[PDB]
Amino acid sequence: TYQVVQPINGDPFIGSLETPVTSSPLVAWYLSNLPGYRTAVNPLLRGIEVGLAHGFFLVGPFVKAGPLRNTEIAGQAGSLAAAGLVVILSICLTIYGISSFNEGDPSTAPSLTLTGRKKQPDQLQTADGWAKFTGGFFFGGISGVIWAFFLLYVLDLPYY
Amino acid sequence: WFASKQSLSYLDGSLPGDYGFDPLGLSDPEGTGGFIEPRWLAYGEVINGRFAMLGAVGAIAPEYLGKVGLIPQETALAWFQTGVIPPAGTYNYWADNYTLFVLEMALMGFAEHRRFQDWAKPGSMGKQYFLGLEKGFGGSGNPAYPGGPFFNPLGFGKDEKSLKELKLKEVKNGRLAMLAILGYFIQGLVTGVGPYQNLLDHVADPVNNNVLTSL
Amino acid sequence: RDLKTYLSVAPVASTLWFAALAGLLIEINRLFPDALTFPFF
C-alpha cells in the first residue's frame, strides 16, 4: 500500500515522476545548495564558485593525458590548455546569454515555488545577470586552473 | 456400495470389474475422439486381457512340460527364447521364421480386421460376402462379446444374468494374466532362464531368492 | 479430383515447367558439351 513512486508534486498529467533520486531529502538538500540554485544570491557570485570548481578540475585530464607529458617534460603546461578551454567556454556562455536574454527583458525563471508560494521573483536569466554569471565564471575558471597548477609546482600528489 | 479405490465420476460400476479406479482419468469422457474414448478402452482391456490371459499360459506351458513332460529338442526354451532371435537363437521350424510371420500376419489379418468391422458396424460382418459363418458373423449386439456361437457354442451363462458373474471373472483373470506376463519381461530380462525355472530358485530356497537377492 | 488438378497448374506449373526445361537443357549439354558455336550450318 505504500509505493515510493509518485506523480510529480501530486500532478499526474505533468511530465515528470517522483523517485528517490529526484525528491529525496538528501538529493533536495544537495541540489538546493549548489551555487546554481541559490536563486537569491548574486549571479556573479554564484558563477565564480562554478568556475573555480570546474577550472581546478580540468587541469588533471589535460596534463595527464596530454601529448606534451606522457613521459614528456612539458608537464603541467597542459593546465595551460585547460586555461584555454575555460576561455572557449566563457565565450559560449557569453554567446548563450547574449542571444537568449535581451536587455530590457525580465527574468524567465519560474516565480512560483513548488508549493505554490507565489512569493518569489527570481534569478539572473536576464541579460544583466547572465553576463555577471559568465563574467564570474571566467574569473573563477582561470583562478581554478592557476591554483591547481600552483599545486602542481609544489607537487606531492600521488598521480602527478 | 461396492469396494473401490481412487476417484472418478463416470466409473458407475456398470462396467465389469469396476473398482472405480482411474487416477489418470483416462476414461473421463469430457473430451472424446480418437482412441481416448472410454468404451474403446473397455473393449481393449478385455482384448488385451484375453490375449494376455492366453499368452501367459503359452509362456510357461512349454517351459513347465519339458520339465515333467514328453518334449525333446522342441523342449521349451524360454518363452522369450524361441521367437526373438538373439538369446535362444530360435529353433528351426517347418517354415522359415520370417515367412511364418507373413503367413501369421496373413491369417490374423482376416480375423482381426473383421472384428474391427464389428466395432464400426453391428452386424456388418455377419452380413454378406458368401460362405457359412457369415451367419456366424454379426453375432451379438456388443462387439466386446460377439456372443459367439461360433464364439459361443454353449450358452454357458450367456442366458443367465449370471453371465455378468462371468464377465468380471473374465475381467479379473485378464488383469491377472496381464500383470503376470509383464513380470516375465523383467524376470526373463534380468534373470535370464525361464519364468518357471525362475520360479524354482525362489522355491529351492527363498531367502536366497528375490530381486534384492537377485542383485 | 478436379480440385487436385486445380492445386496443380498454379505456380507449381512453373516448377514442373522449369524442371522439365532444366532436364532438357542438361541432357543436351551432356550430349553436346562445351559448345561455343553452332557447327552444323
Partner: protein
C-alpha cells in the same frame, strides 16, 4: 552398508511421518493419500542420499 540402509529408512520414515506435520494431498483433493506417500518417500530418499554421501565424505 547396513548403517547406510538404516539411514535411508530413517529418512523415509521421517518423510512419511510428515503425513501430519507436512504436505500431502492436504485440504481437498478428489482422492480416496497415495500421492503423499510417494513424494514423502521420494523426499526421504533424496534426503537419505544427501546425508549418506556426506557420510561417505
Amino acid at each position: 552398508f547396513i548403517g547406510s540402509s538404516t539411514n535411508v529408512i530413517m529418512v523415509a520414515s521421517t518423510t512419511l511421518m510428515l503425513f501430519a506435520g507436512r504436505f500431502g494431498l492436504a485440504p481437498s483433493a478428489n482422492r480416496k493419500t497415495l500421492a503423499d506417500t510417494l513424494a514423502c518417500g521420494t523426499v526421504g530418499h533424496i534426503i537419505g542420499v544427501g546425508v549418506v554421501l556426506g557420510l561417505k565424505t
